[PDB]
């Protein structure tokens, strides 16, 4: 079935599961041609595949060369996403392979199910959760490695840094979704909240700043405030 919030804690039980977001796979810049027309140029993209319990992010970088000479690219991108997710699953030891893959966009269901035919016991599901993984490229270090790639490349990250030393997976996912929702809503202001104090640094091997427990509380309330402020501006409340 589909996921949501009746069974939102199940995301953090001990059946391995992966979220797959494909919204940054095919990425273009839209510009105007010499004859007046409008033309696209592709830039590198990525598949966002996340274990919500562990924080392990499998960031498969999609190099623009994969689109060369192909047609119907937005359709092809779903199939390319499915091909790489299946390849990732096949490269993992059996005891590490997911029992469920949850796609953030329902258009991915058929492509992934067809590429996953060898794994009949792996459930492929959509979700009714609105997740902000499209904003993954607002995380500077993820954007940098995608834009610098000259060839297809897989990069592994822990998107929770060291948070699980101190909080639960449920709390870390909620912090992550809050952060990304704020970056999706008002990116420049969200980045300012995070970087406002230069004495709080990002460790070389982390994505986010090394906040203390009390600072994360303050940061989380500023992100809530940001999202709520933008809601009011949008709907004149």
């Amino acid at each position: 079935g589909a996921m949501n919030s009746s069974n939102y804690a199940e995301l953090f039980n001990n059946d391995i599961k992966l979220f797959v977001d494909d919204t940054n796979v095919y990425r273009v810049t839209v510009h105007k041609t010499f004859e007046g027309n409008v033309a696209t140029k592709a830039i590198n993209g990525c598949i966002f595949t996340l274990n919500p319990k562990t924080g392990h992010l499998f960031l498969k970088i999609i190099h623009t060369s994969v689109w060369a000479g192909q047609k119907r690219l937005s359709q092809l991108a779903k199939w390319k996403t499915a091909e790489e997710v299946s390849a990732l699953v096949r490269s993992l030891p059996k005891e590490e392979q997911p029992k469920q893959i949850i796609v953030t966009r329902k258009a991915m269901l058929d492509p992934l199910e067809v590429h996953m035919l060898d794994f009949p016991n792996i459930a492929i599901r959509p979700t009714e959760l609105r997740l902000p993984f499209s904003a993954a490229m607002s995380i500077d270090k993820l954007s940098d490695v995608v834009m610098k790639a000259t060839e297809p490349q897989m990069v592994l990250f822990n998107i929770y840094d060291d948070w699980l030393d101190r909080i639960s997976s449920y709390t870390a996912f909620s912090r992550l979704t809050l952060l990304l929702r704020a970056l999706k809503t008002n990116e420049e202001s969200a980045k300012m909240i995070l970087l406002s104090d230069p004495t709080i640094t990002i460790k070389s091997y982390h994505l986010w700043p090394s906040f203390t427990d009390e600072q994360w509380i303050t940061i989380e309330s500023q992100m809530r405030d940001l999202i709520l402020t933008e809601y009011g501006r949008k709907y004149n409340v």
Partner: protein, 300 residues
């Protein structure tokens, strides 16, 4: 002209023979159906007046033997039986007709409908789908499930239709995932026509049989199979030209014959919109398109 005698008609019933139907009252002096244009195939079916649950019936070839109907008050249904003693059967059939006790198979000469519907339907293939080797005729009813349904619970009572599953290894070559899902030509031509059905006539025969089982019995798994075998052709970019042209004629007569008030339950909106308006073969079903629009515009 063959004859189907009925021992008695103890319960009020609607009797179908091929595409026709008539009513019989409880304990009405009804002894059968005469003047049946011999075929290659035929179907006699029943729906009891006091319980229209379970429609059931029997596919049969008059040339394979002499068949009659005898009501069984224990199982509570009209059962088909075979009479191996030809002389006895002649004796009953050359007499009860003489009495005036049966009704005539009412074929109009201009009417080639039943054979346009059953052109590729054969009894030997029917008996492979409905497995009951000791009988030369084949029982089907409203409730029977297909082997495919059973895999998603009594195999003896199953409809052994050819399993068609678009999201299965049989349909999708490794390495050709997108290609074969978007263009089912491999699955149609290599797997189904060359591998399993051998020729397009057998393919069309199962399609016709499935349609008729859905229409006459309201058998849901049969309707699924009918729509799947249509969709497989329409979703293939490469289909032999003789198949395409014949498909338009097959479907046209099926749509032509469908009860007008049964369209909400025998037609799958998704499959038909895809085949007529979106698929590779949209422009190959001209007459089916024309009848479906003029007859069922509400589905599309």
């Amino acid at each position: 002209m063959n004859t189907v005698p009925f021992t008695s008609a103890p319960i009020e019933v609607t009797i179908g023979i091929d595409q026709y139907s008539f009513n019989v009252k409880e304990n009405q002096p009804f002894h059968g159906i005469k003047d049946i244009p011999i075929g290659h195939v035929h179907v006699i079916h029943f729906q009891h007046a006091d319980n229209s649950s379970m429609r059931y019936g029997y596919w049969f070839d008059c040339r394979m033997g002499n068949f009659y109907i005898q009501y069984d008050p224990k199982d509570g249904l009209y059962k088909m039986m075979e009479e191996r003693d030809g002389a006895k059967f002649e004796n009953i059939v050359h007499n009860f007709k003489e009495r005036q006790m049966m009704v005539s198979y009412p074929k109009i000469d201009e009417d080639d409908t039943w054979y346009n519907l059953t052109e590729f339907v054969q009894m030997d293939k029917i008996r492979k789908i409905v497995r009951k080797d000791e009988n030369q005729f084949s029982y089907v009813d409203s409730s029977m499930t297909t082997v495919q349904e059973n895999e998603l619970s009594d195999p003896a009572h199953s409809l052994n239709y050819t399993v068609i599953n678009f999201k299965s290894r049989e349909a999708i070559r490794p390495g050709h995932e997108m290609e074969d899902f978007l263009d089912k030509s491999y699955y149609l031509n290599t797997v189904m026509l060359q591998g399993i059905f051998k020729n397009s006539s057998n393919y069309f025969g199962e399609l016709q049989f499935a349609f008729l089982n859905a229409m006459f019995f309201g058998n849901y798994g049969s309707s699924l199979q009918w729509h799947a075998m249509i969709e497989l052709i329409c979703s293939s970019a490469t289909v032999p030209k003789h198949m395409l042209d014949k498909l338009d004629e097959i479907l046209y007569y099926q749509i032509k014959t469908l009860p007008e008030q049964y369209s909400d339950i025998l037609l799958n909106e998704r499959v038909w919109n895809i085949c007529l308006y979106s698929s590779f073969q949209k422009n190959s079903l001209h007459n089916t398109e024309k009848i479906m629009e003029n007859k069922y515009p509400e589905l599309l």
